[PDB]
Design a protein around this ligand. Structure first.
Ligand SMILES: COc1cc(Cc2cnc(N)nc2N)cc(/C=C/C(=O)N2N=Cc3ccccc3[C@H]2C=C(C)C)c1OC
Ligand SMILES: [Ca+2]
Ligand SMILES: [Cl-]
Length: 166
């Protein structure tokens, strides 16, 4: 099972402001949709509630400690172990954020899909620092910048850097 982080952040790792995206880049979300089609999206409650609804064509799994939390059209999981159990047969899952949710899955992550937005926004929550020497870029592509997508941004995808034995 490939555990993948899916993330959009600015030049200071900002991923949110008052629980929302400080930017509006529909093309970026179109990339998320394409990349995650037919795979579970794993996200924290705050993240889910900020989006407002289930994202169709996807197994939406909301992670909260709250045992009574249910929402129609979504699965709820209360721990990492419960997510791995729910996704036991899945080829790849996408950790969709909440800083705390990324942290929960850090010890297991195999692949990073990172959109880097070339701008500094006002933010209050951040993608945790990561030692990228353990990672190797395998794909990059400049995002579509235009009237609807004002900022300049780049899709990056990273896999584990293999070590050469001494
Ligand atoms: C902090 O707030 C957010 C954070 C993220 C996380 C995210 C974004 N981009 C990338 N590459 N990685 C992420 N983890 C999404 C979102 C996205 C929310 C949001 O409005 N949507 N997210 C998915 C989507 C895909 C295609 C077309 C339109 C959408 C759109 C529509 C919904 C299903 C209602 C977000 O909004 C509140
Ligand atoms: Ca792993
Ligand atoms: Cl969250």
């Amino acid at each position: 099972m490939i555990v993948s982080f899916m993330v959009a952040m600015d030049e200071n790792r900002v991923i949110g402001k008052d629980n929302n995206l400080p930017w509006r880049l529909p093309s970026e979300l179109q990339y998320v949709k394409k990349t995650t089609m037919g795979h579970p999206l794993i996200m924290g409650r705050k993240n889910y509630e900020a989006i407002g609804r289930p994202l169709p064509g996807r197994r939406n799994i909301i992670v909260t400690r709250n045992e009574g939390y249910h929402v129609e059209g979504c699965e709820v999981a209360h721990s990492v172990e419960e997510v791995f159990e729910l996704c036991k047969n899945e080829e790849e899952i996408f950790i969709f954020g909440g800083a705390q949710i990324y942290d929960l899955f850090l010890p297991y992550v195999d692949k990073l899909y990172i959109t880097k937005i070339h701008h500094a926004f006002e933010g209050d929550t951040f993608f945790p620092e990561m030692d990228m020497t353990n990672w190797k870029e395998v794909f990059v592509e400049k995002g579509l910048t235009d009237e609807k997508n004002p900022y300049t941004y780049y899709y990056h995808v990273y896999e584990k850097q293999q070590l050469v034995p001494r």
